[model samples]
Target chain A: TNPVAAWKALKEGNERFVAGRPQHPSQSQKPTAVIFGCADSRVAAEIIFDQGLGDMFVVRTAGHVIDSAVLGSIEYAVTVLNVPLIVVLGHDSCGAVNAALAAINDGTLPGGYVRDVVERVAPSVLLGRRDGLSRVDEFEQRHVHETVAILMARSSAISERIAGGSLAIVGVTYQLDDGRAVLRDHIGNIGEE
Target chain B: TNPVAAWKALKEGNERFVAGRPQHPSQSQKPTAVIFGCADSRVAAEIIFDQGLGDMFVVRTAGHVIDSAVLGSIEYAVTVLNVPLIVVLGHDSCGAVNAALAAINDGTLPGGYVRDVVERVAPSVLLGRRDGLSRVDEFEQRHVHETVAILMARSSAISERIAGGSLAIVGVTYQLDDGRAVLRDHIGNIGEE
Candidate 1:
């Protein structure tokens, strides 16, 4: 929702990037996956995914917050372009998670842009404590999963499709060391796992 | 696992593809996601995702099954290349789901190739039935969600990270009309709606 067109553009660009070519077709076109990710710089989906031109549809926000606008953009993608797959890409050493954890536990944020990101991510971290995983990484994973779940539940049109086996929504963490993604459960994928 | 090197090469190729202009670099690299999607001519991941030359870490099976090799290959992407996101993209009106439904309900496939997909997808369909949504779309969504769940649980590494919140595993359905992928719940955001 934050940057609908940008998200699509990035994925498309990554496709081109991976292919060792370019398909920057029309600069005036819309994109695909509405990415709801963090503000982490190292985890750029386009640079890593290698899309070109008009691919992907993204929505990036600190801690990948699921607010009104975020939901609206995803709705647009589904109702508009009908794009499949919403990637809630979380990354390692995320400042968002740290901020949220601090705020949720301590009841306060640094009180600036830092506060903005922390507030959105705090709810999930607070909601996700099960078997003693309140550490940074553990909280991050729980928060990511929590965020993904929120998106699906918030959007009935999308969730209805998911309930019908017509849509998919997944969560993943980006390892900053190698820039690889590890998939986590508790969000996305519904079954024994 | 089907074509690990080839798949990596394709993702690399896509990085090059979107650099400036063109479709792909060499077009020799293979995609495992493509192959694992089953060698079904009508069921194409590449075309559907709009990835050319090299972009996706392709894998194909009878019905996007998660076998040892498949998991290995998927792991390779995150473990090696550091791909930030992994897409378990399934499509609408999937023959695999259909076959699984048939086999589970009746025990037969129209063709051997089709049956292969059916067999792999059967468990998900069975699991989907656990919730027992009365609608076709709802049931299918259950199956897709179940399939993603199976994959998340399929690997300990992936599963641990997911549970810990380092990885996000998602399930999405590709709309046959206009090629849009819609991420579903259980694999997506888990709040609000």
Candidate 2:
């Protein structure tokens, strides 16, 4: 029997990533998880999961927001390369998030392409900025959860694969301090079958 | 010419990633960057940079935090695969960060593997928690910057490679408000030389 533990596995893996030790096969293949995440410098997968070479296929953006190209890349990984899971990673103390917060509060924005990403991220920030959700970390976690949903819905190619149980999409938060991915949302694990 | 690009290129790539459009070229050839990021589910390089299979050698961890194996992976990507850029990514609303924050505030910590990571992330949180940081965002930014410093200082082999311009390690933050990796702490630019 399996622990039927999807979230716990990720949590434990994170323990290794954070403890300066990771569980990885001495010689292994590409990662089962195709991570879609932000390009923040501190949240690399191998460091966090303690994985070695040829472990994962990573896709990154700013807010972990999704667009066409990202979907296509995921499609390729799922269809051709066979990466089974997609981890939508968000973290704490995000700058683009801060920018969105500023945009919401002051109605001022960062210029050029920066604003483009902000446009997608703004809705979440707006939600986080609302009412009692003003705590910076809470707001960020809320937005991260939202972005995961958005990405899951962003593509037919991915959705079809997900439906087939051939792939999974998860939402995780990497705490900047201890360095772990806490499972905030994991829709793929819904059914026991 | 080259326009001294990587930053702009990375930004644009992340834009496409957040937008659900990826222009991944790695399916055809070698990867562009050696990505070291946190295990947060929301971050990935291919989607962020809009690259495809074979385009990047990705290594991830929580907090984009790294250690010996992390260093070895970077060496493999640089020396063996010859990746051009190495990105160390951190994010916003990080649980590890929150745990660290919790640790700092509570002074009494939880037990188990989770607490260990909390301990590692505590230093950054502590440094960022200090006064003079009017905004929490500032603390977050400084945290990412410091992590970048640690990566370079801790890995001399990686540092030498970076110095030789074969690779570059830059610290970035993925704003949870928006899916974007904004460069916060940078040591050298691969686009420079």
Candidate 3:
């Protein structure tokens, strides 16, 4: 019923994935967490988290950008479905992050809505610069942290649930080597929280 | 390099999931498809399509709504990653679709960014209404079609690729019973196209 236990379960599951022992557990009626993750092809949430069908309610985008529909999907998971955890999953060497970081340095951006995706991710890069965080991986991690803060700042329903001890949000980044997903920041308790 | 064959592979994979004979294929370097799917917990694209790691690039949101971010993600998969297939996946009893349908019927919308999600989905419902689509399932199917249309209309990168015979977009909706994902609409080709 609490956020901490829910997170611990996912962390353990990720360990199994990293260790190449994923169970791909079966037949869970209700999902435990709402994963707000990146649209990286290699970073499929259920695969990396070692969860099976219906284990996670997921909202994903390039760079894990929080647009309205993404937020709405997340709010539905939190307020309506009452899922216990929200995981904002990002990853290292993310293409969207690369584009966003490049945009900041070169003053160039892609055409069409991709520019929107890149633009949304740019603020995190900018924030990392402000704090003297020098590496791309650090900026990626900072973006995960920024995404968690944005969820708390923009959604009262989510914030209220965390206040009521009913939910937690964790920011995670999946490293490519051995397929690891590690936590970076969080709000509320995840035991690992 | 061909979309029809890529989609044929996914359809067979979905058949595997339906019949309880999933291979859960092991790793490869690149993904073949970009799945723009709904954020419903029950309709996870990878699980439903019976795809394993690195098989698909996915972007999702409530109601499968099309915002610039989602469009950007899909475009990234197509233009940058050179993925051949784009599957806009939706599902039955979708909360976002239900909310938008109800919002149309009752004139109520949720607060915050969720309202934006509903508003974006509402157009699909309204378009369905225009065609005398009375069933929620029909509206759901129509929204899947509308999303594909929007992608073709909005993204020249996608449209140009379609024109060049290098890309295809398909709309799919997952049915909860026996975990089936069937096609709804298409642009360009899939062998199923």
* TM-score of the B chain in each candidate versus the native B chain: 0.63, 0.79, 0.92
Local error of candidate 1 at residue A46 (angstroms): 1.5
- Tens-digit per-residue lDDT, B1-193, candidate 2: 1113545566677878678656653211445666665543343455556654445556554444444334444554455445666676666655445545666778875443334345556677677656455344565567677767776776665677667665667777777547676776666664534
Best by TM-score: 3
| Better candidate by lDDT, 1 or 2 | 2
Measured on C-alpha atoms, candidate 2 has an lDDT of 0.58
RMSD of 3: 2.7
All candidates: DockQ: 0.02, 0.02, 0.59
Candidate 1's residue-wise lDDT over B168-192, tens digit each? 4555565544444465643322221
For model 2, chain A alone compared with the true chain A gives a TM-score of 0.83
> For each candidate, C-alpha RMSD in Å?
20.0, 21.4, 2.7
Q: For residues A1-193, could you state the per-residue lDDT of candidate 1 as single tens digits?
A: 2223433444455446455564432221344454555533233354445544345555444456554434554555554455555677777776557656666667665432334445667777777665567677777778878877777766777777666654556676766546455556423233322
User: Compared with the true structure, what per-residue lDDT tens digits does model 2 show for residues A115-138?
Assistant: 545566778867766656876567
DockQ-wise, the better of 1 and 2 is: 2
lDDT of each: 0.50, 0.58, 0.80
Q: Which stretches of candidate 1 lie over 4 Å from their true place?
A: A1-32, A109-116, A128-130, A186-193, B1-193
- What is the C-alpha lDDT profile of model 3 across A1-193, one tens digit per residue? 5687788878888888778776864322667898887888475677677776667788888788767677778888887678999988877777778778777888888787778888888999998999998787888899888889999998999999899889988888777765777777878877741
